[PDB]
Amino acid sequence: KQSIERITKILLDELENVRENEQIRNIINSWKPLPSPEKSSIYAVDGSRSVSRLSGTVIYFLSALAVGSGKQLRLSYANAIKSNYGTSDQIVRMQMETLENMLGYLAYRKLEGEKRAILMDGTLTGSLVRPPVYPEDIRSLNVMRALIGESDFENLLNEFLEKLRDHYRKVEEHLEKNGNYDSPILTDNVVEKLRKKYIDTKVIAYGSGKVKVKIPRRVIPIEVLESSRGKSVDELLQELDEEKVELYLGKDDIYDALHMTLSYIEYLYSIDKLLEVKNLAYIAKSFYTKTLARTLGVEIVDTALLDAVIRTLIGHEKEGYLEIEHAVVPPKWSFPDFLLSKFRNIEKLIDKGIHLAYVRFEQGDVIYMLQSTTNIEKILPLILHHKAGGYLRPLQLAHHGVKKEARHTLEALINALRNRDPAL
Amino acid sequence: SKQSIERITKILLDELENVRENEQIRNIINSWKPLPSPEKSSIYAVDGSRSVSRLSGTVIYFLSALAVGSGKQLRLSYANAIKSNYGTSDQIVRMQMETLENMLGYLAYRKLEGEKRAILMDGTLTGSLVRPPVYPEDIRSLNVMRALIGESDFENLLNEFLEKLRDHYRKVEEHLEKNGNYDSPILTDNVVEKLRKKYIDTKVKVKVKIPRKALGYSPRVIPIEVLESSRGKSVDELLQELDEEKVELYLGKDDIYDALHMTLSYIEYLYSIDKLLEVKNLAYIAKSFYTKTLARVEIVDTALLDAVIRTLIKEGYLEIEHAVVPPKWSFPDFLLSKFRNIEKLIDKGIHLAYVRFEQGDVIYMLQSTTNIEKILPLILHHKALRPLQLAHHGVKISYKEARHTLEALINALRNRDPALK
Ligand SMILES: [Mn+2]
Ligand SMILES: [Mn+2]
Ligand SMILES: [Mn+2]
Ligand SMILES: [Mn+2]
């Protein structure tokens, strides 16, 4: 209980590195009231995920729901994947995020009205600030690029790119029937046959659990250097151009770098689709303090902190919203140059900018981080039409309906084939 | 999803029948040694617990470490709030979770009566030392900190802190007998301001040169051009360069501050280890762990190996003939001068053994500083495995009520808003 202060101290000295005025003082009475409601046809989509680790294996269940002005639409999925630290969580998150993105997009398509909107739980920036990626997953592309070369890679891309189009099709016309789908995720279904086509043909066995790979004749793995020593770069080059240079790689790193690559491309595809929605809004109870304020997009105040300040000084505690004057933009690092040419809306988003507002729906209510792809001005009123609490109703229905024993059945399975060993 | 149940099973069997080939090393048929018989021991079992709650952009954590063995219960405890960063918020928290138990198992050895003193940890030694527990975030701050105040000034900073660490470890021990517990097991929090008042602002955005290595940059790929640019050069020298590479960093008060809290945090982290390794008999029991870099020496996660032996052929243990050394680079040059118990473990290496007691219990992963045979029977003395159960049981999530206890107090001061979000 000694800490009980340190925290408080900590929590205060935090607040008051805000109380301290950087263009905030003024910006507060730059707080607008709420526009007037406008009639809209809306859908809100959240998702839940349940993970279970069994030995060095991870077993997850994703669910994503859209409630609203239409009937209820549902995507499901279940899987097992190699456990990791960075990468295990890393994969599943993307899949979770893609189920929702998919849903919002297909939902928008089933939505009748003059003015239509989709409403997502999260932020838009979260993906393009520090995506569920980390330096690790870009390597996966650059490795892939280098290993199977740019010709076959672009080939790989486009074939998968189109496969996903049909996928979206089957998926859509399934929702239309049963209002739900049990196989919304493509990648881990088509990865094997994609390995066998774009990889297994470029490779040979090597001594133990590895593969010998000729390097296509612009990026090359750092290994090639490391493998070459007594030699001048010249010969490293002449060996390159003469097509003799070759690497000895873990057959499995390669599969996972393929699987990542695909999981990645599919996640990106679904953002590109959902950006197709004209009025798209994100709602968040918390964005965060440090990350974005430092995002180099200059500085943001974290509604939890900022709300705290208002009632303190201006004494307001009034509903309304405060727009952040300068529209945001995803960095260059956060997203490849060569992949973008295949996503025109992500392209467009980068170029156009995101608009965002601290929005307080209710009297003494929480400030929400409201991000949108259209001026807060256009979308905010459409958003207000469905307001119920100090919050919006269909999200309240999307979130409370998005959320077990489903597991120990998946303990009760392998018998009929092999062994009960691991899950105990 | 009655379709994917097959797909799940598959992913499994594959990995199973894949362990069905060569990596046998086959001695499973023999090298399995039934149990060396019990020896007398004085034991201690440490485990830990973490409850984290997020409030807006600031994360709240509660740490409960607990040691139970022949002796009396010992409980170290912490509570803190820190700035949330995507992955690292979790990593500071686990590190301190690690620092609690290393620290705690040590002290239990320190006062333990007997000709035989064994501490029993829940976890793995490897998972500790493969890569820094906070990721190459920590190695970063260390270099920034280093480049910042200079090599020399840093060396003194370091020692200063190391010194401080014992002054603590002694006093903690003081409360550790009187009470048998302590609420400020971590200095890393109660010190830092001084140290920068001392080591930073006595000097003090700033431009910082730094190995491009430090942030975990290169490995990835290289474009053909950097090669052509260097053409007329040997490769060896080219790699010199990419290694040699510096870069500039521009740091506000926050980051400068942060790299510090990270650096010392890391420092107290390894301190609890170097100490803990002093234990003459130290065994790690882990049921399942991270096997990836492990093949990088063959091996298999326990429950994976188990199902194999059974599809081929009892209690008892299967050793591994070659102790695994940890990575030397995983810990920097300038630090290990300061840690022999670590420095030795890289030199020396750690012994791995698979273990099962009863008929139907799965096989755990056993690890030790000093070779299996000696240690194992010592542990086997205390079999249930009892000291474990209690070390674990009690340490677990004594209710989250400890969380929502903090809120209603704040408003007595000024503003409860964060307290709500
Ligand atoms: Mn959500
Ligand atoms: Mn939710
Ligand atoms: Mn534990
Ligand atoms: Mn435990």
PDB file of C-alpha atoms in Angstrom, chain A residues 1-4 6-8 10-12 14-16 55-57 59 77-80 82-86 130 134-135 139 142-143 182-183 188-189 218-222 225-226 228-234 236-237 240 252 285-291 294 302-305 307-309 311-312 366-367 410 413-414 417-419 421-422 424, chain B residues 1 3-13 15-17 54-58 60 78-81 83-86 94 135 183-184 190 193 216-224 227-228 230-239 242 253-255 258 287-290 292 301 303-304 306-307 362 406 409-410 413-415 417-418 420-421:
ATOM      1  CA  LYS A   1       0.000   0.000   0.000  1.00  0.00           C
ATOM      2  CA  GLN A   2       3.083   2.233  -0.002  1.00  0.00           C
ATOM      3  CA  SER A   3       2.869   2.303  -3.782  1.00  0.00           C
ATOM      4  CA  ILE A   4      -0.710   3.507  -3.440  1.00  0.00           C
ATOM      5  CA  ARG A   6       3.515   6.588  -6.093  1.00  0.00           C
ATOM      6  CA  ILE A   7       0.744   5.583  -8.484  1.00  0.00           C
ATOM      7  CA  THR A   8      -1.443   8.536  -7.480  1.00  0.00           C
ATOM      8  CA  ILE A  10       2.368   9.201 -11.023  1.00  0.00           C
ATOM      9  CA  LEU A  11      -1.253   9.551 -12.183  1.00  0.00           C
ATOM     10  CA  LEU A  12      -1.345  13.220 -11.164  1.00  0.00           C
ATOM     11  CA  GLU A  14       0.754  12.749 -15.649  1.00  0.00           C
ATOM     12  CA  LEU A  15      -2.454  14.817 -15.637  1.00  0.00           C
ATOM     13  CA  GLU A  16      -0.603  18.006 -15.048  1.00  0.00           C
ATOM     14  CA  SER A  55       1.823 -27.376 -25.287  1.00  0.00           C
ATOM     15  CA  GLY A  56       3.821 -25.360 -27.829  1.00  0.00           C
ATOM     16  CA  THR A  57       0.614 -25.070 -29.830  1.00  0.00           C
ATOM     17  CA  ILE A  59      -5.708 -22.870 -30.305  1.00  0.00           C
ATOM     18  CA  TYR A  77     -13.330 -19.493 -37.308  1.00  0.00           C
ATOM     19  CA  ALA A  78     -11.205 -21.807 -35.218  1.00  0.00           C
ATOM     20  CA  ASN A  79      -7.626 -22.920 -35.556  1.00  0.00           C
ATOM     21  CA  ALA A  80      -4.316 -24.055 -34.150  1.00  0.00           C
ATOM     22  CA  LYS A  82       2.627 -22.652 -33.764  1.00  0.00           C
ATOM     23  CA  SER A  83       3.119 -20.942 -30.443  1.00  0.00           C
ATOM     24  CA  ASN A  84       5.510 -18.015 -30.254  1.00  0.00           C
ATOM     25  CA  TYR A  85       5.948 -14.843 -28.279  1.00  0.00           C
ATOM     26  CA  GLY A  86       5.769 -12.014 -30.784  1.00  0.00           C
ATOM     27  CA  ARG A 130       2.013   0.213 -34.996  1.00  0.00           C
ATOM     28  CA  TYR A 134       6.354  -5.403 -35.953  1.00  0.00           C
ATOM     29  CA  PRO A 135       9.577  -5.312 -37.940  1.00  0.00           C
ATOM     30  CA  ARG A 139      11.014  -9.224 -43.224  1.00  0.00           C
ATOM     31  CA  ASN A 142      11.265  -9.124 -48.116  1.00  0.00           C
ATOM     32  CA  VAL A 143      12.499 -12.642 -47.485  1.00  0.00           C
ATOM     33  CA  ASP A 182     -17.892 -20.654 -40.574  1.00  0.00           C
ATOM     34  CA  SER A 183     -14.924 -20.272 -42.970  1.00  0.00           C
ATOM     35  CA  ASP A 188      -4.347 -21.128 -43.849  1.00  0.00           C
ATOM     36  CA  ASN A 189      -6.582 -23.007 -46.307  1.00  0.00           C
ATOM     37  CA  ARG A 218      15.855  -5.723 -55.872  1.00  0.00           C
ATOM     38  CA  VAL A 219      16.497  -7.460 -52.557  1.00  0.00           C
ATOM     39  CA  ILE A 220      18.681 -10.326 -51.317  1.00  0.00           C
ATOM     40  CA  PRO A 221      18.701 -11.807 -47.798  1.00  0.00           C
ATOM     41  CA  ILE A 222      21.524 -10.645 -45.532  1.00  0.00           C
ATOM     42  CA  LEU A 225      26.856 -11.678 -47.526  1.00  0.00           C
ATOM     43  CA  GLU A 226      27.475 -13.787 -44.433  1.00  0.00           C
ATOM     44  CA  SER A 228      30.655 -15.261 -48.550  1.00  0.00           C
ATOM     45  CA  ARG A 229      33.966 -14.269 -46.912  1.00  0.00           C
ATOM     46  CA  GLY A 230      37.395 -14.904 -48.441  1.00  0.00           C
ATOM     47  CA  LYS A 231      35.862 -13.404 -51.543  1.00  0.00           C
ATOM     48  CA  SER A 232      35.636  -9.833 -52.740  1.00  0.00           C
ATOM     49  CA  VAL A 233      32.135  -8.504 -53.366  1.00  0.00           C
ATOM     50  CA  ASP A 234      32.911  -8.831 -57.059  1.00  0.00           C
ATOM     51  CA  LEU A 236      29.726 -12.462 -54.612  1.00  0.00           C
ATOM     52  CA  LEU A 237      28.178 -10.514 -57.464  1.00  0.00           C
ATOM     53  CA  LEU A 240      24.926 -13.891 -58.102  1.00  0.00           C
ATOM     54  CA  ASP A 252       9.894 -24.200 -41.675  1.00  0.00           C
ATOM     55  CA  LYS A 285     -13.054   4.534 -25.230  1.00  0.00           C
ATOM     56  CA  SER A 286      -9.268   4.819 -25.091  1.00  0.00           C
ATOM     57  CA  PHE A 287      -6.770   5.536 -27.805  1.00  0.00           C
ATOM     58  CA  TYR A 288      -3.600   5.758 -25.716  1.00  0.00           C
ATOM     59  CA  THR A 289      -1.258   8.298 -24.123  1.00  0.00           C
ATOM     60  CA  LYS A 290       2.393   7.964 -25.341  1.00  0.00           C
ATOM     61  CA  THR A 291       2.351   6.189 -28.683  1.00  0.00           C
ATOM     62  CA  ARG A 294       4.922  10.884 -30.242  1.00  0.00           C
ATOM     63  CA  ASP A 302      -5.667  10.911 -24.858  1.00  0.00           C
ATOM     64  CA  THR A 303      -9.376  11.500 -24.113  1.00  0.00           C
ATOM     65  CA  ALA A 304      -9.080   9.883 -20.682  1.00  0.00           C
ATOM     66  CA  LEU A 305      -6.515  12.530 -19.741  1.00  0.00           C
ATOM     67  CA  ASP A 307     -11.705  14.719 -20.256  1.00  0.00           C
ATOM     68  CA  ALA A 308     -10.147  14.884 -16.786  1.00  0.00           C
ATOM     69  CA  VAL A 309      -8.809  18.340 -17.544  1.00  0.00           C
ATOM     70  CA  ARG A 311     -14.209  19.527 -15.846  1.00  0.00           C
ATOM     71  CA  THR A 312     -11.168  20.632 -13.846  1.00  0.00           C
ATOM     72  CA  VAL A 366     -16.742   9.552 -21.258  1.00  0.00           C
ATOM     73  CA  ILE A 367     -15.014  11.173 -24.211  1.00  0.00           C
ATOM     74  CA  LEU A 410     -11.769 -29.783 -28.870  1.00  0.00           C
ATOM     75  CA  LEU A 413     -11.592 -35.017 -30.398  1.00  0.00           C
ATOM     76  CA  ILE A 414      -8.213 -36.457 -31.391  1.00  0.00           C
ATOM     77  CA  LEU A 417      -7.907 -40.554 -34.521  1.00  0.00           C
ATOM     78  CA  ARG A 418      -4.758 -40.783 -32.338  1.00  0.00           C
ATOM     79  CA  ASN A 419      -3.954 -39.605 -28.796  1.00  0.00           C
ATOM     80  CA  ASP A 421      -1.681 -36.797 -24.749  1.00  0.00           C
ATOM     81  CA  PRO A 422      -1.114 -33.126 -25.330  1.00  0.00           C
ATOM     82  CA  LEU A 424      -3.706 -32.776 -20.601  1.00  0.00           C
TER      83      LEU A 424
ATOM     84  CA  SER B   1     -17.007 -25.447 -37.074  1.00  0.00           C
ATOM     85  CA  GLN B   3     -14.985 -28.728 -40.799  1.00  0.00           C
ATOM     86  CA  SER B   4     -11.928 -27.238 -39.107  1.00  0.00           C
ATOM     87  CA  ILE B   5     -11.819 -29.829 -36.329  1.00  0.00           C
ATOM     88  CA  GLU B   6     -10.209 -32.001 -38.978  1.00  0.00           C
ATOM     89  CA  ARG B   7      -7.893 -29.172 -40.023  1.00  0.00           C
ATOM     90  CA  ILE B   8      -6.905 -28.727 -36.368  1.00  0.00           C
ATOM     91  CA  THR B   9      -6.313 -32.436 -35.869  1.00  0.00           C
ATOM     92  CA  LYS B  10      -4.225 -32.509 -39.036  1.00  0.00           C
ATOM     93  CA  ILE B  11      -1.990 -29.598 -38.004  1.00  0.00           C
ATOM     94  CA  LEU B  12      -1.381 -31.679 -34.914  1.00  0.00           C
ATOM     95  CA  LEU B  13      -0.774 -35.191 -36.281  1.00  0.00           C
ATOM     96  CA  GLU B  15       3.704 -32.274 -36.177  1.00  0.00           C
ATOM     97  CA  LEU B  16       3.378 -35.622 -34.405  1.00  0.00           C
ATOM     98  CA  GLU B  17       4.309 -38.083 -37.150  1.00  0.00           C
ATOM     99  CA  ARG B  54      -5.400  -1.148 -18.060  1.00  0.00           C
ATOM    100  CA  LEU B  55      -6.814   2.308 -17.403  1.00  0.00           C
ATOM    101  CA  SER B  56      -6.799   4.560 -20.477  1.00  0.00           C
ATOM    102  CA  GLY B  57      -3.163   4.869 -21.560  1.00  0.00           C
ATOM    103  CA  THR B  58      -1.629   3.938 -18.211  1.00  0.00           C
ATOM    104  CA  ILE B  60      -1.713  -0.945 -13.547  1.00  0.00           C
ATOM    105  CA  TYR B  78       4.519  -4.806  -5.801  1.00  0.00           C
ATOM    106  CA  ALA B  79       2.012  -2.330  -7.233  1.00  0.00           C
ATOM    107  CA  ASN B  80       2.751   0.222  -9.923  1.00  0.00           C
ATOM    108  CA  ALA B  81       1.364   2.248 -12.802  1.00  0.00           C
ATOM    109  CA  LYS B  83       2.930   4.286 -19.448  1.00  0.00           C
ATOM    110  CA  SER B  84       1.337   1.798 -21.854  1.00  0.00           C
ATOM    111  CA  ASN B  85       3.288   0.997 -24.958  1.00  0.00           C
ATOM    112  CA  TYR B  86       2.068  -1.685 -27.290  1.00  0.00           C
ATOM    113  CA  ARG B  94       6.864  -9.807 -16.771  1.00  0.00           C
ATOM    114  CA  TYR B 135      13.140  -7.830 -26.326  1.00  0.00           C
ATOM    115  CA  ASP B 183       6.255  -4.181  -0.391  1.00  0.00           C
ATOM    116  CA  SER B 184       9.056  -2.451  -2.317  1.00  0.00           C
ATOM    117  CA  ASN B 190      12.225   4.609  -6.241  1.00  0.00           C
ATOM    118  CA  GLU B 193      14.948  10.478 -10.665  1.00  0.00           C
ATOM    119  CA  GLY B 216      17.808  -4.798 -33.948  1.00  0.00           C
ATOM    120  CA  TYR B 217      17.932  -3.360 -37.439  1.00  0.00           C
ATOM    121  CA  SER B 218      19.745  -5.205 -40.202  1.00  0.00           C
ATOM    122  CA  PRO B 219      19.176  -8.820 -40.359  1.00  0.00           C
ATOM    123  CA  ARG B 220      16.332  -8.719 -42.851  1.00  0.00           C
ATOM    124  CA  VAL B 221      17.534  -8.023 -46.404  1.00  0.00           C
ATOM    125  CA  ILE B 222      19.835  -5.783 -48.486  1.00  0.00           C
ATOM    126  CA  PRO B 223      19.226  -4.255 -51.956  1.00  0.00           C
ATOM    127  CA  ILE B 224      21.671  -5.199 -54.721  1.00  0.00           C
ATOM    128  CA  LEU B 227      26.744  -4.160 -53.067  1.00  0.00           C
ATOM    129  CA  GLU B 228      27.358  -2.518 -56.444  1.00  0.00           C
ATOM    130  CA  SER B 230      30.878  -1.217 -52.693  1.00  0.00           C
ATOM    131  CA  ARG B 231      32.021  -3.180 -55.743  1.00  0.00           C
ATOM    132  CA  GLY B 232      35.786  -3.476 -55.929  1.00  0.00           C
ATOM    133  CA  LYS B 233      35.577  -4.419 -52.272  1.00  0.00           C
ATOM    134  CA  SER B 234      35.863  -7.721 -50.407  1.00  0.00           C
ATOM    135  CA  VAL B 235      32.681  -8.936 -48.765  1.00  0.00           C
ATOM    136  CA  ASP B 236      34.268  -9.166 -45.321  1.00  0.00           C
ATOM    137  CA  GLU B 237      34.915  -5.431 -45.312  1.00  0.00           C
ATOM    138  CA  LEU B 238      31.435  -4.676 -46.597  1.00  0.00           C
ATOM    139  CA  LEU B 239      29.944  -6.488 -43.610  1.00  0.00           C
ATOM    140  CA  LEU B 242      26.918  -2.487 -42.147  1.00  0.00           C
ATOM    141  CA  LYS B 253      12.853  14.468 -21.857  1.00  0.00           C
ATOM    142  CA  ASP B 254      10.499  11.488 -22.044  1.00  0.00           C
ATOM    143  CA  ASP B 255      12.704   9.096 -24.001  1.00  0.00           C
ATOM    144  CA  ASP B 258      12.558   6.182 -20.354  1.00  0.00           C
ATOM    145  CA  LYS B 287       5.520 -28.200 -17.967  1.00  0.00           C
ATOM    146  CA  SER B 288       5.679 -26.570 -21.410  1.00  0.00           C
ATOM    147  CA  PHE B 289       7.909 -23.862 -22.888  1.00  0.00           C
ATOM    148  CA  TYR B 290       9.197 -22.174 -26.038  1.00  0.00           C
ATOM    149  CA  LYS B 292      11.825 -22.713 -31.406  1.00  0.00           C
ATOM    150  CA  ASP B 301       8.548 -29.840 -26.156  1.00  0.00           C
ATOM    151  CA  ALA B 303       4.186 -33.173 -24.050  1.00  0.00           C
ATOM    152  CA  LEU B 304       5.252 -33.638 -27.668  1.00  0.00           C
ATOM    153  CA  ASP B 306       5.707 -37.944 -24.280  1.00  0.00           C
ATOM    154  CA  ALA B 307       3.071 -38.959 -26.823  1.00  0.00           C
ATOM    155  CA  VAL B 362       2.758 -35.852 -18.234  1.00  0.00           C
ATOM    156  CA  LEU B 406      -7.819   1.748  -5.779  1.00  0.00           C
ATOM    157  CA  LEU B 409      -9.715   6.465  -2.967  1.00  0.00           C
ATOM    158  CA  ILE B 410      -8.515   8.844  -5.704  1.00  0.00           C
ATOM    159  CA  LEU B 413      -7.964  14.018  -3.832  1.00  0.00           C
ATOM    160  CA  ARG B 414      -9.080  15.606  -7.114  1.00  0.00           C
ATOM    161  CA  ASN B 415     -10.321  13.769 -10.176  1.00  0.00           C
ATOM    162  CA  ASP B 417     -11.969  10.452 -14.415  1.00  0.00           C
ATOM    163  CA  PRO B 418      -9.021   8.276 -15.375  1.00  0.00           C
ATOM    164  CA  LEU B 420     -13.395   5.407 -14.616  1.00  0.00           C
ATOM    165  CA  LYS B 421     -11.870   4.788 -18.079  1.00  0.00           C
TER     166      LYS B 421
END
